[PDB]
Design a protein around this ligand. Structure first.
Ligand code: BMA
Ligand code: BMA
Ligand code: BMA
Ligand code: BMA
Ligand code: BMA
Ligand code: BMA
Ligand code: K
Ligand code: K
Ligand code: K
Ligand code: K
Ligand code: K
Ligand code: K
Ligand code: K
Ligand code: K
Lengths: 320, 320, 321, 320, 321, 320
């Protein structure tokens, strides 16, 4: 059962923040500087996750966490290490902004992995104890790698985001497929930043956030968008619907954002003015969805909504 | 009858913030994201204005507002539409940072209007219901267009600010005239940013704020200045006195600011560290002035003072 | 008026062809000249007169008057041109470059990029190419490539321009504006933007008006520069468009290919490598002949020739609109 | 019958330019502006090629060409058009810097193909008349795609060069494999630019040139390297030797360049100071190699050398 | 000398901990102060003295003298300090910031970032914190974060510095220099460079010396700032290194983690958000107590406490050397 | 007996190029790529020098050379290596743009030496065979270090040029003194680039060139000046007169240049459009001076003039 808070009285918004935010504090571990941009899945009779925890050396590491209620997290103090037979791909340099999902027979994790620059690291686990590392999916520079939670016409599929070797000032979302979780291709453009005249919260760069959520009306994609002000970037997040069978085809895309930096814990911290969605839990029976997002690259927050309402919002406000 | 709060006990500042700031919140309209950098005038038995209201799509629109007390505003939910006979000029792309004044027999509105980049839009109204759009006054790129509240020597006059098509890293204030509100010329440089050693709150770029205020000795100009820190622009504002007959001739210019970002509503929000004045109401019989400014490009605040004290300060601290 | 002319080289299939005598003006024509380029030329009396940008050996930018019988061999004054002006503020000289000159109604007008707290369009007139009278700068900075039309358009003066910045400007759209009186300007309209690089990359970074627009029955023939940005800098090429006669901000045709791009050593090596920058043209409607003057590598001046009807047919055939 | 000119008397250089350079002029086609970055192979009883011919609109197109002697070229006037079933991949935006080799049963051509940015296009031909387009091999941004001329341990292999969407100011050579010329993976870093103190001609970026040349001692790689002066980039080229079985492992890499911009045809043109090798023809019986290279992004030149000499030079001056 | 102290909180495991009275110096202490931060403090007489960077409401950077009986409650002079100088050129005031003060042998020395055709390191001395005598600037521009050693090193004065540029410097190594006479400087040695980001990203963009080096039996304890560059700006944190006693350009240990990083509202909001910038320390070798003063968000001044032997241990335990 | 070529009849220029330019070809040594920006002095019966020779690896090294006439040089094939008692200072990273003069008892060499960036390296020699390295004079970043040829008031004196660690976009000339060739100080600003309205060949940055030349009226300084065009830097050179006793005080400074890039060997090369003066030889009896300058960072050229004509030109065209 997914975490949930009823929409506040009078609240007109499609998504609403948890009154318990932030749900994960920056100093949960003895050496944590910040814990954000993290992944969460159901597992056993509770929840598991892979967490981005930057330490007091400002190094970026991944940590496994477990939770009974998906809100109060027990995160391992020791960083996760990946088992790999190839010594060269097995070399840890850094890692951030994990996404996790179950595909058919095991859990997969993707992350931004350092291999002569940022690329997409891939690994699996059957038990959230031992993680086995596969080949990096792409050549650098790439980030915001997010798998589909089932095969698409019999292939693995992943969204990604060609980037550069710095604070990237552009970003289109792409789609790729693999028959075997080793060799990737059939690359297709999914979408580009909107024109600032039309939707400026998503006009500098975009990236996939949580694992795509299957609905009868398409893949529900929650994605971040950036606006470039004189004083930096503002990360907000919104919704689109992708075709079921060819998910590089965008059928609707929201004009307004779903969420943008408003609260003190979103506006002040290591990187101000950031809401960055990394994971969602949902229940199709009740339509409920709970969206985890990094706040100011410092802590982790939750927000709630109803899938049918998010669909309706995406279509009614669509800029395509 | 202008809004007013007495100088706080033992306040030695020439301007003091309203203890009720912000006076206009970001969410006054159903889809407003922010409401800031806005224009206000007396109208009838009360007040009217044109407001920059950025929506939840981060689109920039102008909305008409009305108020009985100049503090609590009733802002029309629908964006303002301009009437124009010329189809090319009457095409709306975006609009921001409006200024409004009465000149002779009607109200005039300038704003930053998109026409193949930022330039200065012009329109007039008699009633804040129908707005007749006139020719854009200049070729792009130009912003911070602010009309004088009477003709100067039989011509209309306007301050402007040549710019570029990004977050402009420079900016001098200029002055121009028009016999007819159609053709503009006799362009004169008013002032450049100060040297950083002399006055750094105004060393990167400057721009006119509220409508110039006539005094016996010249025009009181309240204007924004930017300081470029390692972590962004800080917008503060200050005062100058221009020659009455030839307003490009600056007589005094404040070394110190009048106001700079200090409170959490000025320091945190969509664009941190911004105090951007765009309107003032004044009463020559009492010397009272009330200055409306954008706060963090998020909300609108008010600050109060006396014109003769501001003039005395501007002279006594003059950097010229 | 006998305009300079060389017949198309045998075998040559280009719309324009360079003079075999290029460069026609060398960099060291005056005792202190560093470079002479980006200049203006008109018929005057039984020969030709012009206003020339001559940068000196201090690399200051100045305008000099010149006269020629044949429009090829120029006698340029050693001393810079000075403008008369009753307004001291406007009449203050900081610098000036890239002049254009045309006759409108009753006198010659000069526009140039004039320094007034940055680049703007300076404006003057002369009756005799001896005394020059300065008028208001037409626009607020930053603006350059101000080019007048050679008659009024529906009862108003008209000028092309090009909003810029205070550096090596990395953008540039051509605009059109009007004036009833050569003092106040307005009714600004956008003419064109750089093309997409996948469509026409010689003109994808920025563009600007060159020579005075040439009136044809088919519209105004605009000869204009375009910039391509390589890893090693800007390349300036030039090409042709056709503007509506009555509303010259409406572009009717615009060439895909350039007309001329830097090729010769005098275009590719010099103070600013890889520049062909058209500044003036002489034409003869009787014969269709046109002779186009252009700055070469910001160092010397060259001439190219073509036929107006061929230029027009090329612009149409290859139009990217 | 590969083209050849013997070392000049006295000449101590490992490579020497053809006395006939440039061997392809800029104006060979009726609307060619330049012909420079071009791929040549033995075909039938002569030679065939795909040529980058930028036109007088400065569009980048590829053209097929044929020659008896590999020197005097007859290049088709109309650009090459690819057959493709898939309309999305099949859409032409631009194309440059082709490379061509025979693999097993057909000729393959790669090039820098526009697909929402630069990536590596792939195609094949049996006859150099009709070309059939395959999937782009990678997600943007990537350039300098160069196939190996046989499979490596039963997979197709390709060198590439992760880039950005501008004049890329960085660049490592990578190595990737495919079982089927559709799905790519097992990406491995081959080499980075050198330290400027060590070898400044190759210290900004590098990229593969001609098709790797199999020697008993490994793959001979001819590659470009960039130096950044105050007035622009200078492209020179040099040699390395890659392990035969695992060609991302570099065995030797030359300190000095083989060739750098010196002649007027290399130092004056559309892009000054460029020698950009693009193809080679060689003879294992004689040890001779003829290297085709772009000059100033304007014309095509040829240089000659001996493979074992190049190898010994690569070893003796190795910076690894 | 009784230095300020607060005992570490119940179960706080950190090596340094903030004063519960932070900020100890507010932004509006003086009638025209905009901010007061990045300041220098020392024992003097039977209390304490300092030189404070107080930026005014014109955002000019000036230095003011202050005094305190307890080093927490400060009386800062309203009027900026003025230096007396033999040489009128060197004695010309343009601006000054980021003061450091220490006693060397027989007097107090002040260094600051002094404007002389760009930022450099000004030097002056005082016996009384009333009259200051300015000496030659120690280096040619561009340089800042000049910090003297509190005694001579093998008979010469010694200074850490930080070569810079004329803007928001995006790089920075700490250097070490010597002088026999407080006039001529030389024997320059590189001390350390920013860390690789994969190793220690709080100090990967640039570094600079903070308080005056603190002599320990295990080396000079250097407390220094590091910058990390995020998409939205620079974050300044600070940490610790140990330098060889005899040759202080040789770094023996260097911390992986920071000691302190912007966390509280007064460090994360203000004129420059996300800055903790250490400027001075007071210490007592008998108790091992150290009190470190640091600018917060370039707006106010804060204090943090620790123990010298715990910092030494932290530095060695986490060393990235 | 210094080299000399009479000013051509009719020639009105203050300096004129040797008709034998370039006097040093880029390929004089077996591994040289370029030879420019080099230092020359009288020695014994002829002349000696220290030459910047960049090799075919594009490494920057100094080499010693000798000549009978100062025109035809025999340059040692192997780079100059310094003796140094301190291993930290004695470590060679790179070196360029040497200057050489005799002071009191020996020859001193300054160059731009890499020590955690560019700074001014110092060495002496009695014989041009053995060179003894001294302390680097300054902390990085600094270049264009040029000694005075005698003590000034009992101290060694040096011009320098504060810089950054790239292609430096600014540059003022400074003056410093030393009692002992070990500790430096008394730093004084000499001059800054001119405003571009006034003298644009020297508006971006300047730096000192050859060793200053003592005259009755002051030190004659020949110095380079940069203009920044849209396509790069142009290096020209000119002249100033400094006070004899306090050489940071500038008495006269030329408006026009003396020499600017004009010939193919100045305008085409590794770095186009560079004339970079590094040395001079002069004869007070005749007023003859011969100036050595680098040409396009490729080859070395010579130019001639008369000291009294240079002095009169400098005073007559002075911008001070
Ligand atoms: O700093 C803001 C953001 O920057 C980008 O690099 C992301 O991929 C996130 O990891 C982060 O939240
Ligand atoms: O973002 C801060 C400021 O930016 C500029 O573009 C202004 O003209 C304002 O609209 C604004 O307040
Ligand atoms: O330098 C190249 C070109 O630069 C621009 O500024 C033009 O307006 C011309 O003056 C010049 O030819
Ligand atoms: O402009 C010079 C070079 O630029 C790069 O983009 C290369 O890939 C080449 O196409 C070209 O030769
Ligand atoms: O603004 C952050 C920091 O910037 C640099 O210039 C420092 O030397 C400090 O003055 C300041 O705290
Ligand atoms: O490249 C042009 C010039 O660049 C600078 O770094 C100089 O100090 C010279 O070495 C050189 O001639
Ligand atoms: K799509
Ligand atoms: K003025
Ligand atoms: K906003
Ligand atoms: K148009
Ligand atoms: K490798
Ligand atoms: K080309
Ligand atoms: K060290
Ligand atoms: K001076």
């Amino acid at each position: 059962i997914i975490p949930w808070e009823e929409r506040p009285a009078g609240c007109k918004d499609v998504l609403w923040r948890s009154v318990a935010n932030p749900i994960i504090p920056r100093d949960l571990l003895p050496t944590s500087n910040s814990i954000f941009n993290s992944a969460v899945v159901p597992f056993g009779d509770g929840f598991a996750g892979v967490f981005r925890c930057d330490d007091t050396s400002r190094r970026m590491r991944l940590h496994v966490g477990f939770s009974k209620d998906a809100i109060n997290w027990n995160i391992k103090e020791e960083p996760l290490k990946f088992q790999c037979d190839d010594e060269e791909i097995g070399t840890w340099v850094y890692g951030y902004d994990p996404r996790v999902c179950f595909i058919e027979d095991r859990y997969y994790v993707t992350w931004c992995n350092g291999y002569h620059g940022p690329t997409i690291g891939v690994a699996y686990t059957f038990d959230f104890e031992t993680f086995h590392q596969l080949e990096n999916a792409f050549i650098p520079f790439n980030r915001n790698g997010v798998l589909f939670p089932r095969k698409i016409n019999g292939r693995f599929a992943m969204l990604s985001r060609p980037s550069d070797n710095g604070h990237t000032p552009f970003g289109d979302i792409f789609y790729s497929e693999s028959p075997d979780m080793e060799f990737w291709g059939r690359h297709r453009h999914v979408m580009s930043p909107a024109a600032f005249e039309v939707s400026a919260w998503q006009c500098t760069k975009i990236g996939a956030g949580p694992i795509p959520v299957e609905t009868p009306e398409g893949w529900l994609l929650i994605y971040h968008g950036v606006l470039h002000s004189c004083n930096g970037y503002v990360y907000s997040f919104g919704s689109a619907l992708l075709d079921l069978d060819e998910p590089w085809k965008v059928k609707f895309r929201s004009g307004p954002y779903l969420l943008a930096p408003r609260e003190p814990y979103e506006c002040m911290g290591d990187v101000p003015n950031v809401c960055f969605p990394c994971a969602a839990l949902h229940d199709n029976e009740t339509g409920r969805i709970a969206i985890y997002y990094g706040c100011a690259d410092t802590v982790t927050g939750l927000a709630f909504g109803y899938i049918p309402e998010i669909i309706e919002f995406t279509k009614r406000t669509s800029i395509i």
